[PDB]
Amino acid sequence: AEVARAQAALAVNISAARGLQDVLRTNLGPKGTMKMLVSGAGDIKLTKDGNVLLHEMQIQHPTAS
Amino acid sequence: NTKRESGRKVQSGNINAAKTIADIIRTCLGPKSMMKMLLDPMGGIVMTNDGNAILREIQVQHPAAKSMIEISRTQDEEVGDGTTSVIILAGEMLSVAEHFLEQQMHPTVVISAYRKALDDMISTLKKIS
């Protein structure tokens, strides 16, 4: 089919990550918060911890893997 | 049935598929390497320095995208390596040769330069090996 190459493939990578990452930056130290997490189940989850937010749901990108 | 196919279009797509497959793989080559990361249609990412691992696991196409894995596998079995070389080598020779030479408009002398380049390559190798 098609592909991406040079810095075009790179731009998609580095942008998707830092587009997802700063979303997670809302929370750290005590002065972070508890990020609302609703997966496909519908349950609200509030976590300042990475593993919950990271392994439940993600805005889907090749970097999100 | 009435059908015919004309000249450059396949040759282009050949050169096209030839060099493109060569690109990341030749940058994945060497002490300073790169990585070829596929993104599956399902969303799974596949990162391998070997595009033969990438291309076979992704769309394989009627042009040399069909003819690159065959000669890669031909390069896979015999010695066991050079797997990344042939497609970066075949994509390397065809582009620079053909167009300028097909701009000089001829297939045949192009064919001979291979066997020409084959022996000198054998020569200076076997010499400076």
Next chain:
Amino acid sequence: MEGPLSVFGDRSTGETIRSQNVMAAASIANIVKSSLGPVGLDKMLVDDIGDVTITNDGATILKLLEVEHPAAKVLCELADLQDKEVGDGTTSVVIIAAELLKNADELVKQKIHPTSVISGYRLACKEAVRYINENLIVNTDELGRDCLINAAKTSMSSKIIGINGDFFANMVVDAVLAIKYTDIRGQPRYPVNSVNILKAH
């Protein structure tokens, strides 16, 4: 298939299908042209999708192409039939036919009896055909300096794989001499590959 969209089945009357057929003969005969002769480039041809074949032989290509057009059909099967004669001229008989069917048909319309234009392609054939056997002008293996021996060396020297062809000038004439089978129907024909030829390096 150009022409009206209401009626079909090779039915335009007209020259539409006829021009289509000189076009239908063209593209089919066009395929052969770049495959024409051994110097004809080997044509990678995709039989289905991963199914693919690389063929510079017209007849082998003509096997692959399913003919909806009779033009396509009369060119294929006949060069397929000339392939079942020998196979020398497969790519040959194809190409000239693209022009001649416009040459064969056209003037029969213009009459001067319906039968005249056709033998003109038969007579000039026989003319050439008479001329054919008349030619040792180039390639004489009916005679020669060594005749068949140097003809071997020469036919070696044509295809020659090295400075050899000398020992292989004799081997080929051995092939007719080693096979005495004297092929049936009175032919003194000796199959060249029926010799025991045992390859050892």
Next chain:
Amino acid sequence: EGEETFEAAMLGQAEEVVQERICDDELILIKNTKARTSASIILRGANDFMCDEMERSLHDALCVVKRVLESKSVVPGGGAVEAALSIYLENYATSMGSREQLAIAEFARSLLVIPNTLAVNAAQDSTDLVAKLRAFHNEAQVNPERKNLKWIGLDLSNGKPRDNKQAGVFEPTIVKVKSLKFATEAAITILRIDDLIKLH
């Protein structure tokens, strides 16, 4: 079965059965098989492909020795033989006149695409070859002769007429008389429909 008796009818009759190993190669060599003269040519290559290498170059020499034995003489291979026939047969058209200048010239002009497209496939192409072909070929010499006052031959691994006049890369006389009829055939073949209809 291994207890079965054996008789002499399976025994070969020749001067000697002698086992000769030369070039690290031993064959059972039946010397002068008596019922009929026999010969076998053991190739010697530098490697195995070399034997195949030399073998295909024999095949030119092989069939062409055999094919001229099939039917005598030959043509000069390639469309050069017809490249002279064109103006031969277009003059053979010209004096005929009327329809018979038309069809007979239409047939001879159609001959000429083969050699070019032959040389085209070899990248010796067209304008080069028509410069090569019937510039050699003449009405001044129309004659097949036995010889060349014109070079009417075309060698193809090449695309160009060459100097080898025993060359097996020129065709014999056989398929030529055939293929022309077949070339005339595919043309006259499509003539044949009478009236017209549509099954509907």
Next chain:
Amino acid sequence: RDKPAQIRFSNISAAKAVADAIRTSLGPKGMDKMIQDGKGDVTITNDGATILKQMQVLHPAARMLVELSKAQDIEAGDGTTSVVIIAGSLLDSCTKLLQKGIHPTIISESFQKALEKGIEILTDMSRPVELSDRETLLNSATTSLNSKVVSQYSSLLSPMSVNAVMKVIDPATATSVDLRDIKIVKKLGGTIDDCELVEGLVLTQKVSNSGITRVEKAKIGLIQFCLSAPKTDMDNQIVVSDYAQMDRVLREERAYILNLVKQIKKTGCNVLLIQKSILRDALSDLALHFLNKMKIMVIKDIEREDIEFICKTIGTKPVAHIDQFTADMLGSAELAEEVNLNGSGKLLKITGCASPGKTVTIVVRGSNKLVIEEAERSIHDALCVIRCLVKKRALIAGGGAPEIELALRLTEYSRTLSGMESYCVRAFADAMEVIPSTLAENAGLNPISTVTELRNRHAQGEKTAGINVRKGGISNILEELVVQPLLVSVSALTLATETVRSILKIDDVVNTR
């Protein structure tokens, strides 16, 4: 209304459009067709003569041309195109007269005038032939067989064509001696030279093996019964719930028929034609073995025409049930013969059969089907072209040429009539000349050369002479070695003549409820 006016034009639209390209006729002209059919069926089509009948058309106005095609062939056997292609010539005049404002009935009646004036001239030119002597029979067969499939096998087929009609020939000339009396039986095996004209009733009946009804005093019967047995005709008291119960009734079935086939063997009738009417299924599959065991030829539910051939030709009728032996209304055959040529093939010959001075039977033979075909169709028109002579004698030309001779000379009648129709017949009179032009039309490029001169030449050759499309060149067209019997075109004239005025007899098209 407008619909009445348009539909006749719409008829003239679809109809006349068909009858025209129906002329490439003869010639090696135009590129061969692989016809994808109206349902999508790829069909390789050639030789318009059969392409006539082959043609699948819609609309009433187009199909009447197939109806027109069917008409001439069965009539003469010759000139399949001759009747249709002139419907192109007809609807030429028709529209122009409707464009002239001429009334449909007048244009209709104009068909009859030119027809009478046409059958006038075609007979005027035609040169009479003797349909008794072998000679023009051979000759009309010759040229027809010269236009048929086998020119080489036109030789032996000719006496087999000539003697066939001369078997059925009727005193002097008359329209008679049909092809129904002729029974053409394809015989696998043999060759076209081995095709055999047999005088008597031959059947296409193909039964088991050989030596079966090869004997002498072998009559060929028709039975509108079949043989009895328990579980054939006579009763079974035992019922089959059980394979053992199945066996004793079949055993009793076989054992009884074995006695009956003796009674057929002692009948003198070694071919029963066993009714396709099935009693239990009538003649048992257990019985067929037994009738054949007595060298009597019966195959299950014998082919119905053979039943009627034995009725018609031989006069055989059914008999009483074989239980009663036979009333011996089975016709008189002291020989019925199963002939294997090359030890192969099934042909029932009835020799010594009652034949009514007719039902000559050509046995068209060959080792192939094509071989039988090439024979069978060729002799057929040779049978026909002689049947043509017998029906209506002499000869005109062939390939449309003599019609231009009619066309020239009819315009003279179109000169005399001095009516609207004198113009109408005239509007048709030269519309006839389109045929050889359109015969030579379809092959090519740079078109216009021969067409008007395909007409002009004949008028230059005037009233006797014109161009002969088969051999080329101008002469008296009726014999160049180009002929069809005078029957063929006068048979061609009236039919298309007839069918077209129906279009004018149409007030308006309809569709049934």
Next chain:
Amino acid sequence: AGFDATNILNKLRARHAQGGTWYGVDINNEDIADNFEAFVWEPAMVRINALTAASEAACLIVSVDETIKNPR
């Protein structure tokens, strides 16, 4: 004259493969024949003249794929 080119001219080219002298189509006679005998005539001058002017503007524009202008 109401004739085919080809045949009529191939006739001539037959006649010009054969007699070749004056043979040519004669229009108001509607036929082909030796024209100078037939009185069909023109003084040889303009022919060469036309022949000179024939191949000339021919060999000129055949060297023209390039034509140049100004609007201004």
